[PDB]
From a paper:
We set out to design sets of interacting protein pairs for constructing reconfigurable assemblies. We instead sought to use implicit negative design by introducing three properties that collectively make self associated states unlikely to have low free energy: First, in contrast to the flexible coiled coils and helical hairpins in previous designs, we aimed for well folded individual protomers stabilized by substantial hydrophobic cores; this property limits the formation of slowly-exchanging homo-oligomers. Second, we constructed interfaces in which each protomer has a mixed alpha-beta topology and contributes one exposed beta strand to the interface, giving rise to a continuous beta sheet across the heterodimer interface. Our implicit negative design principles enable the de novo design of heterodimer pairs for which the individual protomers are stable in solution and readily form their target heterodimeric complexes upon mixing, unlike previously designed assemblies.
We determined the crystal structures of two class one designs, LHD29 (2.2 Å) and [name]/[name] (2.6 Å) in which both protomers are fused to DHR53. As for unfused LHD29, the interface of [name]/[name] resembles the designed model; at the fusion junction and repeat protein regions, deviations are slightly larger. To further disfavor unwanted homodimeric interactions we rigidly fused designed helical repeat proteins (DHRs) to terminal helices. Since these DHRs have different shapes, they also serve to diversify building block shapes for subsequent higher order assembly design. We used architecture-aware rigid helical fusion to generate two bivalent connector proteins from the crystal-verified fusions of LHD29 and LD101 that allow assembly of a perfectly closed C4-symmetric hetero-oligomeric two-component ring.
Author numbering:
A (entry chain D), B (entry chain A): 1 to 204
Write the structure that this text describes.
Amino acid sequence: TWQWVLINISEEARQLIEKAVRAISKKEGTEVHFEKDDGVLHIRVKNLHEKRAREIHKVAKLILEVAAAERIVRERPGSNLAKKALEIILRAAEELAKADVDAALEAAVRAAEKVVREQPGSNLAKKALEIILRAAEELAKLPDPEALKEAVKAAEKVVREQPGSELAKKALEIIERAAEELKKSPDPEAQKEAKKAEQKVREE
Amino acid sequence: SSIFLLSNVSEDAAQLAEELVREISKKEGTEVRFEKDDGFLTIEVKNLSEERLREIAKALQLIVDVANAERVVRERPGSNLAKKALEIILRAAEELAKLDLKASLKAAVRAAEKVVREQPGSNLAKKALEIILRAAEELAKLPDPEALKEAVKAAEKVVREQPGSELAKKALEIIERAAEELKKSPDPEAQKEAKKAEQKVREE
């Protein structure tokens, strides 16, 4: 039995940790219980082995490390220190993108997006776009529809930031391959997003 | 089993957090581990009751409630937003003063002393000094040498700030009770500071 108590955690980090724990626990076929008391998030997991619990701790560390470095950047420190913190974000986003969890891949996307928005057209912005594309490739492999909807949205940010780049070409392939998988779903909302995705690749 | 994730806290808040979890753990004789993890504190407690776990949660939530409000005080000094943060610091310090632990009481003394420093002579300082005396009274009842030393220093702070007040008379009563227990300590340094405190009680 395992329990995680999140105190003074930002909502972005909390929800990504909620989805990461719920994902890793379904892998071992275990139920998860969440409750929010006085701004404290209690995550209780039952019958979880050490291997999956250590995987929860690694993903939770990286998400909090990204949030800790984003807090320094948003404090407008020295530009030299801010650059050092953006490299910390990209380092944790790289490992978050090397994990099978959907929430970890979604965390690597949102982490690398803030680096692109912080310094557009920089060497780190290009490395951040590599992280966004690395996460979109693993996110398109996953079967869930929500993962496919984030794989297209993430790849669309690569073609928006660097149109005509080498990364944008692969991002368009990811959008096409993910939209074809979305066409398999009978739900009209999945078919709608697949058509707008196909129309975006047709427009470019 | 239980992992506490604490983010966006200073070094002083983290040190008070570690000692508080260690003290609540001895009530059940459990095992606790800490990790500093660059920007967020990780606390793992094994085989602890859910009540004790939720006592750690509310105590750590009060500590970060003080740390977050202090951050506002040190950034917009003199604003009406600072006056609101000082009332939040006192509201959390009052609840920490009711908790009968050395770390929880030290956190209430340091917090309320920060309100005395920011708003001298105001009604907030008077409410803060009452919390300092409430925590000093609980510290004197604790059977620990360092807790008795802190009760003397906290109540001596009250007589230094507003002397000849109704609170200064109550402070001298607390100083006397703590010094009477300090003289029973075999520690020579405790014997020395107990006489210095009892000498200050004869005066005023």
